[PDB]
Amino acid sequence: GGCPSQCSCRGTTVNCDSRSLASVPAGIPTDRQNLWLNNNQITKLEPGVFDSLTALTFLNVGDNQLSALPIGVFDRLAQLTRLGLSHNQFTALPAGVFDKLPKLTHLVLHTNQLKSIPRGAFDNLKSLTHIYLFNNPWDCECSDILYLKNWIVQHASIVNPHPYGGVDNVKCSGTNTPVRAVTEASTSPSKC
Ligand SMILES: [Mg+2]
DSSP: OOOOTTSEEETTEEEOOSSOOSSOOSOOOTTOOEEEOOSSOOOOOOTTTTTTOTTOSEEEOOSSOOOOOOTTTTTTOTTOOEEEOOSSOOSOOOTTTTTTOTTOOEEEOOSSOOOOOOTTTTTTOTTOOEEEOOSOOBOTTBGGGHHHHHHHHHTGGGBSOTTSOOGGGOBBTTTOOBGGGOOGGGOBGGGO
């Protein structure tokens, strides 16, 4: 039940933000619900890093230096409602990474290096009310963009809700035109 040496704990919250950390601290108590890991220098999460924190409802890992996530890294976080991943350098997300987050209402992916989202990545996010996708270099010439294009069109009111610019603030790299307007004929699997 003890609070990790580098962090401070209050109620169900574990505060590990702004602590110059390179890794998630060991020994976070398993009953804690809100975990702040933002504003550190975490460059890589090890697989399974969060597996014991089955009560988490809030997880913020924004403003770190992550380029990828391990397969399954959120799979045990059944209660998660808010997931902050902004201000990293993710170049891709793993297939299936959000499949086990049925209570997730907020997903913050803005300010990264994402070029597309894998087909079906949001299939099981049946509670999602806010997703932030702006400030990513979306690759609109590659046909892999078509899942995201069709998903944001369908669910326009949940994408970048005010004041974050709406569905139109999901922009193609280079041309800076809206992802929602990409035509299938303008894409190709050979430019991926
Ligand atoms: Mg799938």
